[PDB]
Design a protein around this ligand. Structure first.
Ligand SMILES: O=C(COP(=O)(O)O)[C@H](O)[C@H](O)COP(=O)(O)O
Ligand SMILES: O=C(COP(=O)(O)O)[C@H](O)[C@H](O)COP(=O)(O)O
Ligand SMILES: O=C(COP(=O)(O)O)[C@H](O)[C@H](O)COP(=O)(O)O
Ligand SMILES: [Ca+2]
Ligand SMILES: [Ca+2]
Ligand SMILES: [Ca+2]
Ligand SMILES: [Ca+2]
Lengths: 455, 123, 455, 455, 151, 158
């Protein structure tokens, strides 16, 4: 800020590393995992991250004297070494509320993550967590409906919801696709789903798919008496095409649409979220492309950050991966962002990867969706790990059943209900899971058939 | 603690939550009309004695509100007995119909009363 | 008016106090209760009220000579002392038809009440009544439907209508809210209602509430065979949000919406009133904030003025308080503005607070709504005081019944019908009320249960 | 909340008087001046105010057990006696963020002030102040432009802006009205203004007025080289008429429109505020009808509350009265709400009537407008009291000048500039005001002429 | 209005000729130049003009008893001979404010002049003037601009 | 062909009194007339929108009455809903609601409404499948006298 000009380069460090700073409740806080280049000390790196994601300029400019830049700068207020990693630190940065456009996740990401990742003084950089202050949280709509309202609309209580992705994703005609949908739903699954890739393509145009899927879902609902849904993928090339798709779903009176928020983008996602709220449509969010960004530990953005952003922009469901096939810690990390998606308040907990205490001031929670190579035998585990407020999705786990989709669905619905009943009776799912499943096979031929095929 | 019944508990607006009117009570309600200079008239319905929506769904539109007039309003009627005699003729002819007595206030220029006078068996 | 200029202050008095003035049938007349500062004589105060609510300027301006200001000035044409009050008078002021915008209650209030209340020569000021000339009355739409049409649409005759405010106002989820609505309606009440505070909030967004309330009301209507309604609150922050809410109610085919006319404002209220007329929706008006203005006898505006304004702007129902818990006089004042809301012509009657004879040239009447701490025992009184054309609302009086909402509703419907039958048979409600109620308990367990709980 | 039902009345007190309560930064806090009926102790009154403006019901209802009412109740957390008043106390009440609709001043007032003022246990009630938490402040747009942007658009710096209300309000034809406008503006005033009463009337329809006023203002701007404006009153009977008026102002390319926010209403005001932001129009707000509510010390709402509400809903200017003609204290109270309108942060200060510290998290400030019986001699005082960021309006003080509007304008512009120059040179306006004015008369015949006419 | 029914024709005259009527400031008044057929007396003609431009029916209908037709009827309240014309009179008729749609000249003409000119009892009929009450005048916009604004 | 009525004149009945009845009592008269065998009922030429009976309420109750009479008799029924109004905009609003109700016929006073408005309504009826009943109110002001005016045959061709 201010001047007595005299052009020239100058140095960051003293200006952006403010270890004495007391954060304001209105500040957006970021926890960056910084891997500096050799020779760059930690304080220097932290200061660079702050300067490079806010007001740092490479050479002094006279206009800084027309404002008070201190009021606008990002500040590295804390640094701590990462255990078991040489030259790697967690740097905490505070950003003033005034830097951000209200209600715009697009602007939030552009400001924090738009520039710093390419800074030469850093070898690698990863955003691990963001503390979104409640005054900024209030500028967003959040989920169109959220957990509580969704269960009330669907009249489904006391158990995880169940879905199934139709496969093969490409190749089936709209009608054969709908046939698969009806056979799955009539067996007891609550939802069926379009693959993230299924938008509108040569062998299956979107309108034809939406139309046959509607016929299939209404027929399954009339047969079973339970409310059904099919995630109709509205992801498209332009905002106009996406809206056309959402509008037809509305015309059909169906309950839920879907959007690939990362490939579609936050600007389009927020538009669709607002439309769903205004029209009573549930919105299922698929996280396609997330691993391009969140997989590597040293660079990118951890998924918990992409999950908070989605809760703000808006979605009623969001894919959170399976906790299956991974060790504890990764199990703990998942449970950690699951709390961040569902709860109103989550206290800081480094054992679960939660760097900041986060409050949501009544913004609705998002239902996490467990998907990926799961079948009947993982049921006790999934129920134990996620609890009731989750959607368990079985693609191959349903369409791979030897007797077909309907029995495949029955097997999954019976397996889930057996676990819920057992848990409610006080049985230990963690210890007695396999026994609970086996007992159910005694009276369920469908379940017994499935158990024979898998694991 | 009693639970309000759900089956066969259809109502017919004013006075329908009271025990059915006796001939004396019925005559007293008719005298109320006459004493106020309101014109009595009878209406009957054999099909649906309750409101429904078949022909349209916009606000304020309902089917089943109009029933069919038994003869004409009883202009100049001065005796509750006349009205009750008609209720008898109507019941004689339509023992299967719901019959209600309505009244018109020509000064306020509007229908002003309506109460069920007869319900077919099992209602 | 006119001139021979020469700038300078000058004096009101002679110009605005016109005790010889004969009012025109086109004039808007106002009765102000004036409490002058010590030392200000009555004629001086009355003249100040007239000047200060029309053409009085603090210093002579040359432009007055370009018109005939006499044709535009307000005139204090009569003053009379208030009994039992020292230095307090009723000053009558006449305003020419030409000062007002046609169809605008907003402009009517701005012109009469927009400036005078802050005049230093006055200690306090209260507008008690306005005589709205029929030529101005004809410029307004008035109620979208009114008493006669409402009864015809609903097919309800010969008894007060019955409603119930859902409580707690905040805290219930849209679905539990709708459950309460269905249990209330199925018991015999005609309407259920949103609290004035219930618009759209974190735990219950408006669209979800409208949707569940629709399901509940249709289910209660199908069960009982009687037409039902739920006052869906459309009050919002902007005209656009209010319209969005009214439009969805239209889409649902429901019969009635609600608006807080004072907190929403007259400009928005007139818009909603016109929309309701064009779309066949009944409009229930809640008077939230009225006591901020109409409570004190020495300053503000009496409710009868706010009631006339609403009849012009438009509403089918309007809250008029209970006559219960107050002495005669206050009982007489209420009955007085009730006539002003319902009738086509009301003669001047100072014993009831009616300062001017008022004609409405066939503008529909408004149904008064009695609400506030009432229960089954007040039924004979309410029926006697209000007559058939009223809506009696029981919030705690229904949801507070020991067996629940439905029996709570039955108790109120039976109590009301017992009173109506008795009155029709010639029984004296004023003398035999308690006996009429007790006899009904003999055959109504629901009513007997209620009678045990209250008074 | 919760139950074990058993119907019946019950008592408030313990539930709503929570003297141990620590307020949350997200709570909306209210300071009520409570005058209890004789026999009602203070704790009882405070508890009644809290219960009656939130969850208090007159009889227990079973539905309270479906929620946690504690999370939704208003709480009286502090009470303090009022000095020099018997049986009068200031009761502080906290309301949870969740009770309010985002961006709706209409809902904020309905919730806090919609019901309590009529409670029988109270003799009188006045809302003195509200602490609006920053998380709620962020849900509003605030002023369409605000102080800083307005000066930049108009290119006016270092002195109060000057306006003049055209008089007589009614009676002039649109063309003669415009003639008065041109003569006023060409003399040095920045703005001219429609009276609050001037909307659309028989002798002067709105479109004709807007059109002639446009011709007049453009002619005055071309003549002087300084940017000019005329507050075109858009106040109307319906939202549709108000919008039609704003739209024509946009078509004319003029800079500012006007709205009577209290008579028009908050719902319509927020609509107009949003439109002005989207279309680059400044919005002048007139406070017609305020004294009906804010005048009496024992009942109503203090103007500082109506001023905060306007800053949230939106307005670029707002009438704040003159500090002239009143003793200190009232002078201090005005300066207090002036800070509340202009600044970003105002610390609690009971000597100025500021009951709560208020932050605005960068919501633009509103320009206060001093109006009412002022002329050239009050100039030093007004400049001293309000400072540069204010609009000084002279109706009679301009049109009452002996040589006409233009010289009347010159006199005011010279008087103001003489004071600004003097203050800037270090002269004491409070002590040397009259001397500063007299010296200017030596070289300004226009000013000398005015000084002769007034005081 | 009202009844004790009993169908059948009946006679106008007494019902529509109300020479004692005091007009209301809200009434629309019409001055008709009436040329009756030979044999039709003036009071009879005036009553026909009023009945035929309001509630007169050729045969009694039971629905009249559901309202108060007096509140809706046109009334011939005055008749005066035309000088220099045999069998020609000016009949004054009053119409209640409630018969007209606000702001609709189309409805005003349909109500007053839509039917009477073809009545057989009349040889000829001419509407000379209408007194439009100020309460009805206020329901119209009137000229878009008018004399003063145009100049 | 639309009405499926052949080999006989069609029959209608004008509801009386024209003014005075409330929309609901008006509809009651309509249902009693139609159920007896008449094909149409009709609004008087004067019945547009007035204080005691606003147009929308009348259209709505008349719809309920006509549908009830049609269901009872099995024969198609209609009620000439008068769309005559003060402006083109009001006339169109009325025709549009008749369309929304799915009813078969509307009415217009072509001489008092005027030819410009009549042609607009005629084009709308063709585009929306509505039959149009025309009332000749005011004709005798022009066509009665043999020596001056216009004979009705000219007004009929127009
Ligand atoms: O198609 C499937 C699963 O099919 P199947 O049920 O047959 O395994 C899901 O879209 C991915 O598992 C999601 O990926 P991510 O969880 O990484 O978002
Ligand atoms: O919530 C209620 C009453 O609930 P309950 O029926 O339980 O008393 C009403 O809104 C107020 O009484 C109206 O206030 P006012 O009559 O002053 O407008
Ligand atoms: O018309 C004027 C002043 O004219 P003049 O300049 O001739 O005094 C203003 O609208 C009021 O003073 C405002 O009232 P409030 O300040 O109470 O809002
Ligand atoms: Ca997939
Ligand atoms: Ca309430
Ligand atoms: Ca003014
Ligand atoms: Ca006719």
């Amino acid at each position: 800020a201010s001047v007595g000009f005299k052009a020239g380069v100058k140095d960051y460090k003293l200006t952006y590393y403010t270890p004495e700073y007391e954060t304001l409740d209105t500040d957006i806080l970021a926890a960056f995992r910084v891997s500096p280049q050799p020779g760059v000390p930690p304080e220097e790196a932290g200061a660079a991250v702050a300067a490079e994601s806010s007001t740092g300029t490479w050479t002094t400019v006279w206009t800084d004297g027309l404002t008070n830049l201190d009021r606008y700068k990002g500040r590295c207020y804390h640094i701590e070494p990462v255990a078991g990693e040489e030259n790697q630190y967690i740097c905490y940065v505070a950003y003033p509320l005034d830097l951000f456009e209200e209600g715009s996740v697009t602007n939030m990401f552009t400001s924090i993550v738009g520039n710093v990742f390419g800074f030469k003084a850093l070898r690698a950089l990863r955003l691990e967590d963001l503390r979104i202050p409640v005054a900024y949280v209030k500028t967003f709509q959040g989920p169109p409906h959220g957990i509580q309202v969704e269960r009330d609309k669907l009249n489904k209580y006391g158990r995880p919801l169940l879905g199934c992705t139709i496969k093969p994703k490409l190749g089936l005609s709209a009608k054969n696709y709908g046939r698969a949908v009806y056979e799955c739903l009539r067996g007891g699954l609550d939802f069926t789903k379009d693959d993230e890739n299924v938008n509108s393509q040569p062998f299956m145009r979107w309108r034809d798919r939406f139309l046959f899927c509607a016929e299939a879902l209404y027929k399954a609902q009339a047969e079973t008496g339970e409310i059904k849904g099919h995630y109709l993928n509205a992801t498209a090339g332009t905002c106009e095409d996406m809206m056309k798709r959402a509008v037809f779903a509305r015309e059909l009176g169906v309950p839920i649409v879907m959007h690939d928020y990362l490939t579609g983008g936050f600007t389009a996602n927020t538009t669709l979220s607002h439309y769903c709220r205004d029209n009573g449509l549930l919105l299922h969010i698929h996280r396609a492309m997330h691993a391009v960004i969140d997989r590597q530990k040293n660079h990118g953005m951890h998924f918990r950050v992409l999950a908070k952003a989605l809760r703000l922009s808006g979605g009623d469901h969001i894919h959170s991966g399976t906790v299956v096939g991974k060790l504890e810690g990764e199990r703990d990390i998942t449970l950690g962002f699951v709390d961040l998606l569902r709860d109103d308040y989550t206290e800081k907990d480094r054992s679960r990867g939660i760097y900041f205490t986060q409050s949501w001031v009544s913004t609705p929670g998002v239902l996490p969706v467990a998907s990926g190579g799961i079948h009947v035998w993982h049921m006790p585990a999934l129920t134990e790990i996620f609890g009731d407020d989750s959607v368990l999705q079985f693609g191959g786990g349903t369409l791979g059943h030897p007797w077909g989709n309907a029995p495949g669905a029955v097997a999954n619905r019976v397996a889930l209900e057996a676990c819920v009943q057992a848990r409610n009776e006080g049985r230990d799912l963690a210890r007695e899971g396999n026994t609970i499943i086996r007992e159910a096979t005694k009276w369920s031929p469908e379940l017994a058939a499935a158990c024979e095929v898998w694991k | 603690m009693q639970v309000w019944p759900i089956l066969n508990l259809k109502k017919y607006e004013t006075l329908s939550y009271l025990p059915p009117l006796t001939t004396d009570q019925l005559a007293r309600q008719v005298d109320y009309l006459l004493n106020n200079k309101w014109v009595p008239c009878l209406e009957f319905e054999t099909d649906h004695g309750f409101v429904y929506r078949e022909h349209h769904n916009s606000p304020g539109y309902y089917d089943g509100r109009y029933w069919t007039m038994w003869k004409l309003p009883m202009f100049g009627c001065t005796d509750p007995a006349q009205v009750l005699n008609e209720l008898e003729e109507c019941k004689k002819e339509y023992p299967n119909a719901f019959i209600r007595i309505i009244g018109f206030d020509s000064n306020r220029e509007v229908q002003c009363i309506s109460f069920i006078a007869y319900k077919p068996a099992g209602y």
